[PDB]
DNA sequence: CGAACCTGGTCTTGACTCCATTGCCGGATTTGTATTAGACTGGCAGGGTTGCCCCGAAGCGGGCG
């Protein structure tokens, strides 16, 4: 972002494997993502029986999770169920 | 027949005054968004009844040998 101004010309090697570093990251997003879509359906679960459908709890709590893995840290060394379970 | 008057709408002006129209400001309340770090990871209406239409075995008769 801060290269796409003039701020430096491009070099092939590192643009090319900057490219891929950065479209890596968002393959990792979503291996996460559809890693933890098990445990949004598990706490939607209950929330039934009131107003909405279950695949609308679901897909709110998909969106959620989206959140949680947005501002998840993994520094305090804690699992990340415990911190996407607030959010979801 | 001429003058004075009474009272008809007719109309101006000066003063009062009163209430809508913004307008600001301070506060109260009301609505909308972000954030909570132990770990937790695949459910439940539901069937039953009645009636009608579409494809598959099967005789089977005609073409085939």
């Known amino acids: 972002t ?10 092939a090697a590192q643009r090319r ?18 890693a933890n879509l098990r445990l949004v359906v598990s706490l939607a679960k209950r929330y039934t029986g009131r107003g ?21 840290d993994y520094t305090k060394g804690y699992k990340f169920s415990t911190y996407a379970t607030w959010w979801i």
């Not at 801060?2 to 070099?11: H, I, T």
């Not at 900057?18 to 890596?24: A, F, P």
């Open 52 to 72: 909405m459908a279950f695949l609308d709890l679901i897909q709110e709590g998909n969106l959620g999770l989206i959140r949680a893995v947005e501002k998840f």
């Open 2 to 11: 801060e290269l796409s101004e003039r701020g430096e010309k491009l070099p």
């Open 17 to 34: 494997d900057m490219m891929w570093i950065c479209r890596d990251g968002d393959r990792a997003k979503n291996h996460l993502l559809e």
